[PDB]
Amino acid sequence: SAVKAARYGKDNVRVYKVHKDEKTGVQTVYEMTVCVLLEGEIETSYTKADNSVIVATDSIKNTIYITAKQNPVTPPELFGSILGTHFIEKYNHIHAAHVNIVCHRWTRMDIDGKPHPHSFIRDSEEKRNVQVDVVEGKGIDIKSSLSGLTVLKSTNSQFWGFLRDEYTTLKETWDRILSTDVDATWQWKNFSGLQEVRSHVPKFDATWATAREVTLKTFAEDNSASVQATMYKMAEQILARQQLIETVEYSLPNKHYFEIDLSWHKGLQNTGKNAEVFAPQSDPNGLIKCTVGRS
Amino acid sequence: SAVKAARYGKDNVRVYKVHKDEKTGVQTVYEMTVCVLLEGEIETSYTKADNSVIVATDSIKNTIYITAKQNPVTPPELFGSILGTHFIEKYNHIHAAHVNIVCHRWTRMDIDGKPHPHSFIRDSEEKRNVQVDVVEGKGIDIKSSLSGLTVLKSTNSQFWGFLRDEYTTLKETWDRILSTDVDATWQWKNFSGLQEVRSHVPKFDATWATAREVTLKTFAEDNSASVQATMYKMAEQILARQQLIETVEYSLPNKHYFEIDLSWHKGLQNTGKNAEVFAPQSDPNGLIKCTVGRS
Amino acid sequence: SAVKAARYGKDNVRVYKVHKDEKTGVQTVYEMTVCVLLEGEIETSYTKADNSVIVATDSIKNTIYITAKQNPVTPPELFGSILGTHFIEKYNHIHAAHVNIVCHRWTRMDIDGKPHPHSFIRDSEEKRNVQVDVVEGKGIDIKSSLSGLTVLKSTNSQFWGFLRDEYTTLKETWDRILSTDVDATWQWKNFSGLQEVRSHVPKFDATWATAREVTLKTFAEDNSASVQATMYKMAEQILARQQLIETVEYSLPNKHYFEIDLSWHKGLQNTGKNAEVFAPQSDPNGLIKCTVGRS
Amino acid sequence: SAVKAARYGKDNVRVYKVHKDEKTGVQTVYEMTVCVLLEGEIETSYTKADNSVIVATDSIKNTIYITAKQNPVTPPELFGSILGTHFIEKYNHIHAAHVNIVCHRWTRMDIDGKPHPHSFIRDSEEKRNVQVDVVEGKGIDIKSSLSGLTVLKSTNSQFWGFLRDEYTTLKETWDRILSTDVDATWQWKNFSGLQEVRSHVPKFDATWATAREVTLKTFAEDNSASVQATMYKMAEQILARQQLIETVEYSLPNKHYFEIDLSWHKGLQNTGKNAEVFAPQSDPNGLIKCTVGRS
Ligand SMILES: O=c1[nH]c(=O)c2nn[nH]c2[nH]1
Ligand SMILES: O=c1[nH]c(=O)c2nn[nH]c2[nH]1
């Protein structure tokens, strides 16, 4: 037997950082969960019990804290690139670093109409994420994403004209509820290294904001012919607005809300145009994916 | 042996309702999870296999949907009271109904600065809840709550002057992070029945809003001497602003963020006044409770 | 306003302990999660910011580890009693301690048919729990429980003869699937103090084993007329076999498995006597409770 | 823009099936959660709102139930292959089916030392899984796995001789606790189609059993030099015992249990050879992966 692939590291490293403005007194907090896995010339730790090639996972944990102390942690694309570059430069035998970062929301509180200098609220479970792969001699590949953005519209969604055969019971509809949890990922052009990532820093937050804005507006305004058709429209617009993105991927559950026929009870009318009370379904759910690129 | 207490019913009944304004075209959605347990002269279903006394739990589920179709579902204190009253009036042998309702957030989206007529976002996992106990001959007892409101402040929290003995290692502090998930419950004066609950309908939403507002402002503005001291201040203000509340209860975790000493690494300074990077602790946590009433 | 009730402490304290037999070389592990909340003359910490009355929650955490180092941790009823007694005896102003313990399964592995001296498997998510309330001058109240015991039987469950009215759609049945997660609690006679708890130590493990055995046998063998009827039979037998128990409480979900009519597809027969494929329902579920005592 | 990849289908489809032996009266249950995603000539549903190419996800759900009614559901490798083959054969424009199946444990109860004909217990959260990719013209690729197998050993694990630099604080150790949740995957040789999968049916259950047995024995018996070294030994043995497997992959968290220094309290000795009470750490954790193949 032989080792065909191997990677190892530390997962679920929770990190908080505060910035304190000396002048204004305003404080800003960042909280993330970080995972770092390394690859390189480490096969002998598996095959011969040779621990001399292992950077201990505890040391990786230490490095994440030290790196956060010495560098900005925002935007996460930059922090991930700094952290990954560290490992491949510091250790001769380590040739790839894979860094995943989940950013948690701490939104500044408004009290009596003005922003508070040091108080924050978790205003949603929505996350902003990055996956950064730093590979020696091949640059830095970055995928940025948002996830856990849960939306619903109560009308202006249709679903008709689908294939019907002996396996089909679903009725065509011209008015249904549409609800999903949005997972959207944009993949950047390969960067040659840390200098190039630094040159594009302002684009990272701006592109996240654009992706979020396009997602929400398109969902609200599209008279949706299907999940497939609406998600394509979102991805098209994101690629149009940021030339440094190569592909956009959406993965969307279709979270079903079923009509409840109540006619059995005193002829009560609760279906079609009369539908007011619905039963949300926990499972099963549709799952619709697409990756859109440039032609 | 004898049956000392018994209750039974349906849990985890998910309900959605939409209201459609005919004039304006604006739609508003409500989504809840409902649990209803009944008590009464039902002992023989346990002791003698006598099912004739059982309102089937499936029928309770049907009743929740029918009741939601025929009545407003907001404020939840009113809906819960209507639903509980139904069971005790409809069935001679059922003498108590216990209704719990969890309300999920569907907040109207703003698109290009204006509110969308039919699109919504789950803008937080914070819940608004009610527990309603309808007991034949003893009226209606209502506890209203908010939960899952997660906050953090980065300074203006202290903790010093506590008992020190041979079990104490904790250092006194004049500046720490304070973070919690707020669970706050206000218990109303007993109501004689459904007419009295209806007479107070406008107070329910207003009191929820006040409780939320007082919680957030007090947390942001109090230079906190302890969790105990700050939570007392919140409860005091709520009782002062709504005379129909008899007690307020808070249950608050103290979610710890620990300093990380980095001095072992090149004399790096990251503690006390120099602390920038912290390690959030998933467990254990402090848990602090108090019920405040009128003197 | 006035403090009507208050308690505070540490939650989610994870503890592991190992015992190493010097002779045989056999090791045995225990893992628990512990919560301790105290009550007493502590109102001034809430009302006047007087921290001098507070045993810091960090110190409570320290005490749990020290107590586990110096005492046996099994049976959990004994460990909880020792831990609660400590707080009320050590601190003059603390008059009640409330200790909850969840025990996690680490079952010894059999390798090649024999028991391994030091290797363990989490063979189920089933828990054994205790709640111990130690109140100065009023002794020690102990409730022991098992929870998270998930079972299913595929036949020998019936449900017919229930109340039918204009809210009823459910069909009577003489053969259905029955599945539940068992939560069973037995409450001991009040003990005068730690000496009395020590005198009954052998009864604690034996009663847990009996409760488990009666639950499983009754479920497997009863041709069930309803959840209500079967659970009563379980509780009756437990009270009969241990005179030091005053009450038994069961709380049982009815986790539904629905028939799927497939007749629309080529006349396929999948209902009644022909039912083979079912759809498990995640929600809603029945919830059935009963507390049985001595007559 | 252009569609670069697309797949869609139904997730979280819960299925139960019962087999009833007419002679013996013995019943056997199977419960699974199934996900099916399709690929093919479906781009126009995204780009032109052309629903004529869409097999509705509701119809996929129907097909899973029908297929389970007409075919055996065990071993899951066979059921997944039948289900995937159906879609590519039935629909001309669908060219790939991806089927994931999670099998839940329903273990037959022993009552009074003998096996019960119709009663079952969920004896662990451990799962048996399959991923089956059926691609038109390229056969059937099957990855089988077990997951959620949680183990701990209290001694006979070491970790010393690792790289030490200015980022290292971890002390070398010759005796520590080792605990993990095992995720192991074995990938089969490509099969030409359903006839070939049928020819190997007996190997599927036997190989799962072997993989489980090797995992448990190796973990219990290896005086572990590192997670890396022990996991390699497991994978080596599995490949040796089943020639139809091409690769084995393990993904293993290192779930840390930390010593607690209690010397601050009355010189209490709880570290090194005196360590009895430990603090399990919820996070962070090591994460160690390896894919082993044939040389
Ligand atoms: O938008 C949808 N796309 C689909 O593929 C589908 N299948 N059922 N409902 C559906 N809705
Ligand atoms: O506010 C606090 N109250 C307490 O009781 C406590 N114990 N440790 N830290 C603490 N903080």
Ligand SMILES: O=c1[nH]c(=O)c2nn[nH]c2[nH]1
């Ligand atoms: O055992 C049962 N008890 C009940 O009260 C009930 N209601 N629906 N199905 C039921 N089954």
Ligand SMILES: O=c1[nH]c(=O)c2nn[nH]c2[nH]1
């Ligand atoms: O087995 C281990 N492998 C590792 O890479 C490691 N790092 N810290 N502890 C460890 N244990």
Ligand code: NA
């Ligand atoms: Na390198």
Ligand code: NA
């Ligand atoms: Na009544």
Ligand code: NA
């Ligand atoms: Na005392």
Ligand code: NA
């Ligand atoms: Na095809």
Ligand SMILES: [Xe]
């Ligand atoms: Xe969508």
Ligand SMILES: [Xe]
């Ligand atoms: Xe607080």
Ligand SMILES: [Xe]
């Ligand atoms: Xe039961």
Ligand SMILES: [Xe]
């Ligand atoms: Xe391992």
